[PDB]
Amino acid sequence: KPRYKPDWESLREHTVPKWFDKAKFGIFIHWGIYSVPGWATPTGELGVPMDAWFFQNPYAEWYENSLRIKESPTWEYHVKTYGENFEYEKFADLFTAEKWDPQEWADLFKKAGAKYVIPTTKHHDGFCLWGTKYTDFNSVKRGPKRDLVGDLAKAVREAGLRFGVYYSGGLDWRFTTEPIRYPEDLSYIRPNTYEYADYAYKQVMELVDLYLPDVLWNGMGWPEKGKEDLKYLFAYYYNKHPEGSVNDRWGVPHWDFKTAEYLPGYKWEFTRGIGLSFGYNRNEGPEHMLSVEQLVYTLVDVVSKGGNLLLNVGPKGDGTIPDLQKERLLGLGEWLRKYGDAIYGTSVWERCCAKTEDGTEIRFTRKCNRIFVIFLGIPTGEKIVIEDLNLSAGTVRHFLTGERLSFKNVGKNLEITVPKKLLETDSITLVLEAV
Amino acid sequence: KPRYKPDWESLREHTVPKWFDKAKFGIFIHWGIYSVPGWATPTGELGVPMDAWFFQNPYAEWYENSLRIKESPTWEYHVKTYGENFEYEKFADLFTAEKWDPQEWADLFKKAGAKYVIPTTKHHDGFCLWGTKYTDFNSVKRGPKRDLVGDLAKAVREAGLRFGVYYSGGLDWRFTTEPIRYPEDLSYIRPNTYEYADYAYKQVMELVDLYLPDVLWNGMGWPEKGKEDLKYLFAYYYNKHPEGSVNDRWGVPHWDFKTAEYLPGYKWEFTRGIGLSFGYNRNEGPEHMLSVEQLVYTLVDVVSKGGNLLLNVGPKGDGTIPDLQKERLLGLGEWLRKYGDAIYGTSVWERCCAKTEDGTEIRFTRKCNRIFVIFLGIPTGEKIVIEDLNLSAGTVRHFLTGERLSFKNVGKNLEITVPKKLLETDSITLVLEAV
Amino acid sequence: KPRYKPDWESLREHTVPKWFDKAKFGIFIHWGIYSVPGWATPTGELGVPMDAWFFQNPYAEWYENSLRIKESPTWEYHVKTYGENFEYEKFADLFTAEKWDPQEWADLFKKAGAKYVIPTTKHHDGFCLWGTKYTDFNSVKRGPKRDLVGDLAKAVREAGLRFGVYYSGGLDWRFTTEPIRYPEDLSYIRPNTYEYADYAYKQVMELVDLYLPDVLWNGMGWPEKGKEDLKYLFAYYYNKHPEGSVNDRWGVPHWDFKTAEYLPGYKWEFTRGIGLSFGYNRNEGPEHMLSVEQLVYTLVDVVSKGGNLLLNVGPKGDGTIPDLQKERLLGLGEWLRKYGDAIYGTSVWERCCAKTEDGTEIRFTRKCNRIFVIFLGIPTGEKIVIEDLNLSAGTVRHFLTGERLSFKNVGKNLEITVPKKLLETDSITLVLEAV
């Protein structure tokens, strides 16, 4: 009755679970002691000059790394705000999560249209948000005096959502003293010890035994000395939980989905923040965040290209989700409540994309015979010409109302008439439906 | 003056020590905290349906593994007898060995005809029966408050017997949470950690330094990550104790004897219990155990085929040896006191085996020129025809009395006349002696 | 801005730092708890019968190893002086360094002409002379209650000298119980554990972070399991401290200089004691030590052949340097104050060596155009014929005074007249200077 064996050839048998492929949209949570200072220079996105990136790091979870660079703006801010005698470690005692309600979060992610949730159980600073027995630097012994991963796991599952775990396998600044100043530094500033490979193995195993997560989401690769451990760990995981899944940031020959942070025959997932960082950043306002309209557009783009969206939320150290983020999540969810059928459970079509003469981008998703045509915007006119597309027969109709639409092939293109009556009832995106 | 070097080519120089080849018969002791419950379903022997084996495990030392399977009869028995809130670990506090006398055991094994003794210093549950400094889960800090391995080592040696050690290198359930339900589970449900490879190395070394055992008997393979350590450990062992020996369950290119648990040019050893399990089992009665006659027959069969017999004894948690087991050991010893010369110090002949027309099995052993003919039973008649055997000359005579016997070759066969007078003085086995 | 990458091909880019090549002469310090007994049989030098070497070990730092051999003279001396119930470990409590002044040492090494200093931070007995967090068996928690490595680092640097560290990577008798009796024993009597490879990595790293030494001087190889760690550790070291250096006793493809303990195109270094041992030995008198004259002769010989001299000092457990050693260091320094220009900052010539008809050895060093001719002794005569050497033109003159000397080529040889007036002002060595 155990199906999976501990070797890569055997672990290939485990394909991406249907629930994940159908889920389309999940929530990432970067929440730690780094949330307490919750500070970073909001420079930009990947592809900002990577030479200065670590010196002007827009990722607020990297606070400790930035704090270790004395030249950095983070060091100035830390000394000015907390003093030079305040070690990063001490944020664990200020990290109280006093106003945290896990069910409010789970409900928020549900209403946002999210189908799975993945919190940082341990990020690069090595602080663990569960009562792990392999370090005392955890949320049960320090600040919150509470198993944050567990109580969130109960909340997300009770809300009917899948629960995955993020674990920083590659980096752990409890095991190094120097900061990362350039990308090349990452090739040698790592724990490197056999001890650490055991520590990571033991910890992810502990996560598996305690919470049996639906996703194992690893960050920054797996320690070279422990890479062979993963075939034992995957087999173990899958045999306990066949519908479990695993990302592609381990550095070994197996993964269930690829990740991207900037039509394919494999399942993948785009991850990004609502803002510029993953962890809470005070300095971010609306100018640094995507709008409800842009989130929708992104989500539709990714789904049409075969991917999920893993949108990150960065809560404050008190356990509340900033109104700027909550606002955008509820907006996305309001579009999903309305157009979900065109997203959830869909498949890629023969092409991802097309455009009008007016310049409006178009994205396609499939649901057996039903082909959704999702416009990235609402054309201000009845006559709509789609460039380079033909339809041989059948019935094209307006998705939201169900009203039949007149259409015909004009050479390479396809003309469709959509009455203003119908275009005016749509929100953010005109959606059509063919057969 | 150090002969052995730490590489497999060099360690091949160490052949099986003469004492072991000459010893023929040794005692295994499976004794732990698992002895306290001392319970298992007495299903059968290896080759019972291996699909159900772990679910209906007849090995009482596997109690914890069986306890971890909630479906199992062991789980029912544990809850009913000790409660669900009684963790396996707590048997260490009930394991008092209150009536243990190590010299009574040593004397018992001596009278049984045993030439060496091998107790479980640490089995799969990871409880160590010596004051090891690498774990507190040992017999010095817990229940017995006593170095059981050491005090037994003194007793066995004072009785004039060789003392080996059993160590579970392959399995240690202090390092895993899941049970073994199928054989395939063993390929991934292991400690797996570098930590554990160090732990096993350090522990066997500690055994070597403290007790310098005559046999290193490993169980369930050696951790893959520590396999290279063994060439250092063997060289070390042999250089301290050249007459030391090592079994073949390490998974590396060197061994002094092979083990079997169901005419060869290498030394080997058959191991089995007096009953169906190795550890004490309450549920076993005489119907589940070999008789004195069967033990003799086994011992003779194995010795004629070049092997030793490692017969297992399973003591109670109070440190007493059940009368059913003691009875059979004393019976074997009574046959050995009588026919020892035909077993101890012997060698394989040109063939192991033969049979009479009446169907009685025959086994041969050699002692230079003296060829022992051991019948598996006592024929009820003077005229005895051995199928397919000839003797060219010399003098065949009755072993116990020394009386010359008349014989001749009849075609393929050999006829021997053994007067009822002599057949009636033998016990269990007619033994003859040729030249 | 990080130049070095963690692979051997990339680490070859780091050549020996100029300061080291120019330094020529450094001081080794073997100082530990072994200094307290400070005892060894002064047998001889390497190339003494190596069969008896460990049994009659002249290296006083090996006391514990010798103590573990019950046959040895060290065992007799220990029992007689301290009792059989006095474990080697307890010397850590007698090792008080009560009269230690680090600035007196630094000043002593400065006046001796030494340009760098390398103390044993941890030798084979595993006692660390700094407040390491990876073992309590250190100088901060035990005897001296003081960071000896650190306070010496401050003293040497304030005196203007470079400070390196010696670390015993290969051997650590905190991790083994058996002694080394023969050289072959070293191939298996080692820590061997993954644990230990981590321990050594972590400890040298800690040295790098705390003191950023100018030399990493490893002893007895690097643990096989940790050898790959060194490319990460070297890159790390070099990127923090490009002028750092590394010796060749790691057993990996990279080193900055070779070591010797008995004309090459690579930089190397001869290491030896003033006496026969490295650690303090009571039993050594002047008969076992080199004279000021011999030290000079050695230093000149090594420098002419492209090497540095790493002369060892062995202090008492009270932190004082024996007068026999201090005397010889001050003597060497008095010659260096006088002839330094001919040694410091020099380069190898087209040949190392030559000789007179009278049998006096000669050594050459180069300083651009200035070619120093250093006689190993002072000829008692004006006419000096150097065998097999010609000079085409230029001006040969007496180094100390600057007085021009008459000379000519006579066949293969070169005759030089040096007035008694000038030969009588030299000390230990006649030095000439050509162009």
Ligand SMILES: C[C@@H]1O[C@@H](O[C@H]2[C@H](O)[C@H](O)[C@H](C)O[C@@H]2N=[N+]=N)[C@@H](O)[C@H](O)[C@@H]1O
């Ligand atoms: C989700 C995100 O992952 C990591 O970010 C990394 C980028 O995604 C990218 O792979 C580059 C190469 O490295 C980035 N690391 N940084 N900064 C985490 O580091 C990050 O904290 C966050 O968890």
Ligand SMILES: C[C@@H]1O[C@@H](O[C@H]2[C@H](O)[C@H](O)[C@H](C)O[C@@H]2N=[N+]=N)[C@@H](O)[C@H](O)[C@@H]1O
């Ligand atoms: C002596 C005996 O050894 C192990 O038993 C194993 C069998 O001998 C056989 O090798 C199969 C493949 O695995 C058995 N394990 N089980 N159950 C120990 O497991 C057993 O406890 C005992 O020590």
Ligand SMILES: C[C@@H]1O[C@@H](O[C@H]2[C@H](O)[C@H](O)[C@H](C)O[C@@H]2N=[N+]=N)[C@@H](O)[C@H](O)[C@@H]1O
């Ligand atoms: C400096 C010196 O190094 C080691 O001595 C070793 C010799 O230099 C040589 O390499 C031989 C092969 O092994 C010697 N070891 N011994 N004895 C150290 O062992 C010694 O203590 C000292 O540090």
